[PDB]
Amino acid sequence: VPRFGVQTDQEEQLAKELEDTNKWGLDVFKVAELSGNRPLTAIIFSIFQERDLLKTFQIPADTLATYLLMLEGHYHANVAYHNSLHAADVAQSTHVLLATPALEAVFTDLEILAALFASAIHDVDHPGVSNQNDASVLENHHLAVGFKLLQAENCDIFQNLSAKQRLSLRRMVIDMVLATDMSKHMNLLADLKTMVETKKVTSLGVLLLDNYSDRIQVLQNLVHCADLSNPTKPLPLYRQWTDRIMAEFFQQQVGFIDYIAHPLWETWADLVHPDAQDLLDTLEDNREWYQ
Amino acid sequence: VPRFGVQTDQEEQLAKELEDTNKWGLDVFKVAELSGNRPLTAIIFSIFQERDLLKTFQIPADTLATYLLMLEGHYHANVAYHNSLHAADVAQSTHVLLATPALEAVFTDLEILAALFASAIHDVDHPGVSNQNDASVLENHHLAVGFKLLQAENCDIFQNLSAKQRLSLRRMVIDMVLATDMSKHMNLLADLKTMVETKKVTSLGVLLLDNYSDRIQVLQNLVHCADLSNPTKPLPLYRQWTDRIMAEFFQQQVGFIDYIAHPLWETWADLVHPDAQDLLDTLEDNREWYQ
Ligand SMILES: [Mg+2]
Ligand SMILES: [Mg+2]
Ligand SMILES: [Zn+2]
Ligand SMILES: [Zn+2]
């Protein structure tokens, strides 16, 4: 099994680029190229190794590679934005958000594993916005696909988790992937604002979420924020995401930053102040049309 | 009837801004504000007056105002991108493309009127990309709505056109609005490339389209280009369009510039060389992620 589960000629440059795995400014587009166009597999391996998750949950390296290669293969490369690169970006953003100082020692390794897995499969088999009941049918499909692939030969990365752990993780993953459904945005934001107003921090300045009910609300918002993190990334990266979104948009009052991204990121920023101010500053920069 | 069919307090600044009606860089967002949020009505009046179309086709000023106010009212303000501002922008872009030196004296006043009308109604009553037979059902709906509004009291702006002219214009309008259906993009581009290869210019350097069959192909591509002109506009404007598209996108290989906008604009540029090189230069600037 290759260093990052992927086979590439420029494995040297790939490793160097992946040194920014813990950074919000990671150039995932560069990772995509250097990984032989397998950003998701490379990113998840880099993240898992960084968090020592393979050893913690006894996830066989070859099993992870096989599952990821198969998962990444179920994202449609012809779909401009909702492809494995977006999945890799969301997982990596989730990884950094989880490492926020304000959330230190708040989540268990299982909750962390669930958030990263959810991020990895959250848009799998997306057919494209123009080709997409009324109860998160699409997000439930992403979950179904992400889960079914675990049943393939040598693909069950959770084989060494107890039944109790699998039940917990499955439930959390479902909750987080369903939280990426934009129709749930307004209600999720309301919940987050409530978490902010009733926030409680220790003397060390760390959030206090002793109750699971509160933990899952934060985790849902965290992954939702990761999914909507494009505008908080450096302009060069944001413009590339924007170019992809427009291609998918055209494939066969008003404003994204003002009405969707800002209200959400400002609230998240309040939850972890001062940890996310840099993101708001970047958002503000990207909002300056004439700058 | 007000100077531009719309009632506003800053009519003074509106007139000044509309002095750029013949310019590709027009700040339509500014026009929207200065017109009391009625960009389409203001822009069409400015264009029609500029081309002296009201006198040419005896279009009563009050009739035009009533029709436009009603048409603009059928665009959904809550739809982030596909609203009356996009319609105004496409009509104004069509106006400038038609004035291209290479197309001087090529089209009749009726063909010009049809192209501008088509641009004005081309997306009317659009419900938003996430809320949108297989034969341009949506574009045919835009046409149905645009046409039905002409039947309202004092709304028939074509009342003074002969039956022969109405038949011709109706046919051309249908052809141009259907040409905005992205599923027809590839075939339209093929047609345009054929128009380019078999191009014929006079000694004065003006295109020769003596045959209607060729005229309609160029007109269809012209309005299609107008609909896809966002990336050829100055970055500040492009970023605002992009922000609107992303909001609509999220409302409940790969790349827009590289695979959709460039192949089309390069072909158009060949048709009218050197008239549109500035647009390609701007497109190139907007394609520089790190610039
Ligand atoms: Mg999704
Ligand atoms: Mg349209
Ligand atoms: Zn997503
Ligand atoms: Zn349009």
Distance between the termini of chain A: 46 Å
Largest interface, counted with CB-CB under 8 A?
Answer: A-B, 34 and 34 residues
Oligomer: homodimer
Q: What is the CATH architecture term of chain A?
A: Orthogonal Bundle
Tell me the major beta sheet of chain A. none
Number of strands of chain A: 0
Q: What's the CATH H-level homologous superfamily of chain A?
A: 3'5'-cyclic nucleotide phosphodiesterase, catalytic domain
The computed structural class of chain A is mainly alpha
Along the chain, the helix and strand elements of chain A come as HHHHHHHHHHHHHH
PDB class: hydrolase
Keywords: PDE4C structure, Hydrolase
Assembly: dimeric
Entry title: crystal structure of unliganded PDE4C2
Description:
It is classed as hydrolase. 2 copies of one chain form a homodimer. Chain A has 14 helices and no strands. The radius of gyration of chain A is 18 Å and the shape is globular. The first copy, chain A, has 291 residues and is mainly alpha-helical. Chain A has one domain: 3'5'-cyclic nucleotide phosphodiesterase, catalytic domain (Catalytic domain of cyclic nucleotide phosphodiesterase 4b2b), CATH 1.10.1300.10. Helices cover 59% and strands 0% of the residues of chain A. At the A-B interface, helix 12 and helix 13 of A face helix 12 and helix 13 of B. The complex binds magnesium ion (2 copies) and zinc ion (2 copies).
